[PDB]
């Protein structure tokens, strides 16, 4: 995996459903997935009901997180303390 953590990061979340997202900057979630809430490049980009988060696997790709970034429905996931 990576070595350093993502800056701005907030916390980790867990999906509760399987939502296949196929976009140029989407975030695929699978019922029981792990995602990290990170601060997007702007609130104007943030979608209504969806926020900018990264999957655990993407974390390992922190090297290219800029290309691992995506959007996911928060109302479809769960926050992890």
């Amino acid at each position: 995996g990576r070595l350093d953590l993502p800056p701005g990061f907030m916390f980790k979340v867990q999906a509760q459903h399987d939502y296949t997202a196929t976009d140029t900057d989407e975030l695929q979630l699978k019922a029981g997935d792990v995602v990290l809430v990170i601060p997007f490049q702007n609130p104007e980009e943030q979608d209504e009901g969806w926020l900018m988060g990264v999957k655990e696997s993407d974390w390992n790709q922190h090297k290219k997180l800029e290309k691992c970034r995506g959007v996911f429905p928060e109302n479809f996931t769960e926050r992890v303390p």
Binding site: H17, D23, E45, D47, G49, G70, P73
Partner: peptide, 14 residues
């Protein structure tokens, strides 16, 4: 029973 949200736009991060 989490209700699935509506289709979101192409959120191109940069």
């Amino acid at each position: 029973l989490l209700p699935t949200p509506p289709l979101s736009p192409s959120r191109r991060s940069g």
